[PDB]
Amino acid sequence: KVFIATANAGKAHDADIFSVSACNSFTVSCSGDGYLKVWDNKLLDNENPKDKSYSHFVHKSGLHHVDVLQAIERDAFELCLVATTSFSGDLLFYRITREDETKKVIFEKLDLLDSDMKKHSFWALKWGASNSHRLVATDVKGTTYIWKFHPFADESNSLTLNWSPTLELQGTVESPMTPSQFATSVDISERGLIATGFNNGTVQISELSTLRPLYNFESQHNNSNSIRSVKFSPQGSLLAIAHDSNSFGCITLYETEFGERIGSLSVPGEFAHSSWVMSLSFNDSGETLCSAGWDGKLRFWDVKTKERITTLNMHCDDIEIEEDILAVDEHGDSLAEPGVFDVKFLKKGWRSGMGADLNESLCCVCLDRSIRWFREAG
Numbered sequence: 001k002v003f004i005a006t007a008n009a010g011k012a013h014d015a016d017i018f019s020v021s022a023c024n025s026f027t028v029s030c031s032g033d034g035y036l037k038v039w040d041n042k043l044l045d046n047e048n049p050k051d052k053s054y055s056h057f058v059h060k061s062g063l064h065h066v067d068v069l070q071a072i073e074r075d076a077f078e079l080c081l082v083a084t085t086s087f088s089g090d091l092l093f094y095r096i097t098r099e100d101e102t103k104k105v106i107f108e109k110l111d112l113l114d115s116d117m118k119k120h121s122f123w124a125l126k127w128g129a130s131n132s133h134r135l136v137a138t139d140v141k142g143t144t145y146i147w148k149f150h151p152f153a154d155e156s157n158s159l160t161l162n163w164s165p166t167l168e169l170q171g172t173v174e175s176p177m178t179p180s181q182f183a184t185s186v187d188i189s190e191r192g193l194i195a196t197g198f199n200n201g202t203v204q205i206s207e208l209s210t211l212r213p214l215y216n217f218e219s220q221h222n223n224s225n226s227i228r229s230v231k232f233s234p235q236g237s238l239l240a241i242a243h244d245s246n247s248f249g250c251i252t253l254y255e256t257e258f259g260e261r262i263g264s265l266s267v268p269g270e271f272a273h274s275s276w277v278m279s280l281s282f283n284d285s286g287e288t289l290c291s292a293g294w295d296g297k298l299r300f301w302d303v304k305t306k307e308r309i310t311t312l313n314m315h316c317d318d319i320e321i322e323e324d325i326l327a328v329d330e331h332g333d334s335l336a337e338p339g340v341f342d343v344k345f346l347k348k349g350w351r352s353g354m355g356a357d358l359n360e361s362l363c364c365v366c367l368d369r370s371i372r373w374f375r376e377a378g
Contacts (some may be wrong), residue, residue, distance in 0.1 A: 001288070001300070001309060001310070001376055001377070001378075002310050002376075002377050003298075003300065003310065003312060003362060003374040003375065003376055003377065004374060004375060004377050005312075005318065005372060005373070005374050006351070006353070006354035006355070006356055006361070006373050006374060006375050007043060007049050007320075007353075007354055007372075007373045008049070008318065008319055008320060008370060008371065008372040008373065009039075009048075009049045009050050009053070009319075009324065009370060009371050009372075010316075010319030010320075010321060010324030010325055010326060010368070010369070010370045011324045011326055011369050011370070012029065012037065012050070012053075012365075012369055012370055012371045013029065013031035013032075013033055013035060013037060013369055014031070014033040014035075014369075015031050015032035015033035015062065015369070016031060016032040016062075016341070016367070016369070017029050017030070017031050017341060017342075017365035017366070017369060017370075017371060018030060018031065018032060018063065018064045018065070018341050018342065018365070019063070019064060019065045019066045019341070019342045019365070020066070020341075020342045020343075020344050020363055020364070020365045020371065021066050021067045021068050021344055022041065022068065022344055022346045022350060022363060023068045023069070023070030023080060023350070024041065024070055024347070024349070024350045025040070025041060025042075025070060025078070025080060025096075025350075026038050026039055026040055026041050026068075026080075026096070027039040027041055027344075027346070027363050027371070027373070028066055028068050028082055029066065029365055029371055030058075030063035030064070030065070030066040030084050031062065031063060032062035032063070032064070032087070033062060034057055034058055034059050034060050034061065034062050034063060034086070035055050035056060035057050035058060035063070036055070036056045036058055036063065036066060036082060036084060036094070036107070037053050037054065037055050037056075037371075038053065038054045038056075038082075038096060038105050038107075039052065039053050039371070040052035040053070040103070041346070041350050041351050041352060042352040042353070043351075043352060043353040043354070044353055045353050045354055047353070048321070049371070049373075052103075054104070054105035054107075056094065056107040058084060058086065058092055058094075059086035059088055059090055059092065060088075061086045061087040061088035061090075062086060062087045063084050063085065063086050063087075064085060064086070064087060064123075065084060065085045065123070065124055065125050066082060066083070066084040066085075067082075067083055067084075067125055067126055067127045068080060068081065068082045068083075068096075068127070069081045069082075069083070069127040069129060069133060069135075069149065071129070071133060071151060073151055073161070074161070077161055078097070079095070079151050079163060079165075080095065080096040080097070081093060081094070081095055081096070081110075081127075081149075081165070082094045082095075082096055082107075083125050083127065083135060083137075084125075085122045085123060085124070085125055085137070088121075089120065089121025089122055089123075089139075089140065090118070090122070091113065091122040091125065091137060092109065093109065093110040093111075093112050093167075094107045094108060094109055094110065095107075095108045095110055095163070095165075110165060112165065112166065112167040113167060114169075117145075117169070120139040120141075120143070120145075121139055121140045121141070122137050122138070122139050122140075122145075123137070123138050123139060123140050123182070123183060123184065124137065124138045124183065124184065124185050124186045125137040125138075125186070126186055126187055126188055127149075128188035128190075128208075131190075132148045132149070132150070133148070133149040133150075133151075134146065134147070134148060134149065134170075134188060134208070135147045135149055135167065136186055136187075136188045136194055137186065138183035138184075138185070138186045138196055139183065140182055140183070141175075141180055141182075141183075142174070142175030142177075142180035142181055142182070142183050142198065143172050143173070143174055143175060143180075143183070144172060144173040144183065144186060144194060144196045144204075144206065145169070145172050146169070146170040146171060146172070146173070146194070146208070146211060147167045147168055147169050147170060148167075148168045148170055149165065149166075149167055149168075150165060150166045150167075150168060151163055151164075151165050152164055152165075153165075153166055170211060171211040172211070173194065173196070173204070173206040173211055173212075173213055174213075175196075175198070175204065176202065176204045176213060176216040177198070177200070177202060177216075181198040181199055181200045181202070182198060182199040183196050183197065183198055184197050184198060184199050184226060184227055184228060185197035185227055185228065185229050185230045186230065187230050187231050187232050188208065188232075189208075189232035189256075190232070190234060191232075192207060192208040192209055193205055193206070193207065193208060193214075193232060193256060194206045194207075194208055195230040195232065195239055196230070197227030197228070197229070197230040197241065197243075198226075198227060199224075199226040199227070200225065200226070201218050201219040201220065201221075201225035201226065201227060201243060202216055202217070202218050202219075202227070203216060203217055203218075203219075203227055203230060203239075203241060203254075203259075204216035205239075205256065205259060215258070215259050216259075217254070217259045217261075219241065219243045219245070219250075219252060221245070221246075223244070223245070223246045223247065224244040225243060225244055225245060226243060226244050227241055227242070227243045228242045228243060228244065228276060228277060228278055228279065229241070229242040229277070229278070229279045229280040230242075231280045231281070231282055231289075232256070233282055233286040233289075233303065234282055234284065234285065234286040235285065235286035235287075236286070237255050237256040237257055238253060238254070238255065238256065238262075238286075238303070239253070239254045239255075239256050240252075240253055240254075240265075240280055240282070240289055241253075241254065242272075242276075242277035242278070242279065242280050242291060243277070244276050245271065247275070248270070248271040248273070248274065248275070248276075249271055249272050249273035249274070249275055249276045249277035249278075249291075249293055249294065249295070250264060250266075250271055250272055250277065251264060251265040251266075251272040251277055251280070251289075251291055251301075252264045253265070253306075263306055264306075265289070265291070265301050265306055265308070267299070267308045267311075272291055272293075272299065273291065273293035273294070273295045273297060273299065274293070274295045275293055275294035275295035275339070276293065276294040276295075276339075277291045277292070277293055277294075278292050278293065278294055278339065278340055278341055278342065279291070279292040279340070279341065279342045279343050280292070280343075281343050281344050281345045281362070282303075282345065283345045283360055283376075284345065284347055284348065284360055286303065287302065287303055287304065288300055288301065288302060288303065288309070289301045289303055290343050290345065290362060291343075292340035292341065292342060292343035292364055293339070293340055294339040294340070295337070295339070296313065296314045296315075296337030296338050296339055296340065296366070296367075297311055297312065297313055297314065297337075297340070298311070298312040298314065298340060298343060298362075298364055298374075299311045300312075312374070313337070314337065314338055314340060314364070314366055314372070315336060315337060315338075316335040316336060316338055316368040316370075318370075318372065319368075319370055324370075325368075326368045326369050326370070327368075329367070329368075335367060335368040338366040338367035338368035338370070339366065339367040340364050340365070340366050340367075341364075341365050341366065341367065342364065342365050343362065343363070343364040344362065344363050344364070345360060345361070345362050346360065346361045346362065346363060347360065348360050351373065351375065354373075354375065355375060356373075356375035359375050359376045359377070360375075360376050361373060361374060361375045361376065362374045362375075362376075
């Protein structure tokens, strides 16, 4: 299989674009300048993604994680909720709606957290859809938090679709080590497991129903050995972990019943990327894993064979509109091969236009302040 660029936007935010997510209706990015940007996914051929993009200021400290929940309630009612975390440690929520028939996006801030929860400094977050919805987040001190999301305050509201969301805290999972370390990443599986990655290379697996830690393991080994991304495969009992290993980027695979290391992904072998693997994203079936590297590459791996199928090399001049190419950074250094901060697979049908319809697609955000979309080709 191969992946081909379909649309992109250069100078898409005014500062680093650290995270990107998506739902059927749109792709959403966040940046260190403090803004969220929503990108309409139903894009007409040759249409400029920027034309249909909407910006919203969130917090002056900048934003480093975003995820969106697009709930389908009763087959006809859109509930699209963006959760985003700021460098200040705040966890903010916005309901995304569209104007009557202007298509103009409206962001409504929702106050869902209690005052005591706001005293924590949150880092990673992830929506766990359709199970009552679930939200998981970590804080910088190492704790993992789990809430149940409810679109209606009570059944009388549900019966009239009077959206009135609430976030009900289920509990927390404490870090396994002392002193506690920075929890850089988290994921929630479709089968009731939570994984939390730390900047010392440790990963802790917990049970979603009891909120009890099951076990914790270490990647292995002055140099950084930080975990950067943890993702459960949608199929089977596999967990992919991206982590630093002496200036290089690794991806190690683990079976989730006991946490045994069962394999690794690398290109002719030693490492997955020549620099850090910043993020990971599985496709819908879980047969392909895309990794985003600080080396400016997206690599696509066939999970079964553990082989790299294809590699896309990001370049600042990939940007279609010449005026939006950002060829050097603020220090004047070349952005010829911009590191990739995050990558996200989009479900079949989410992306419209540029021949993507009916094929799965992908989006990544890079160090040259760009956002790029690709479609899987035959």
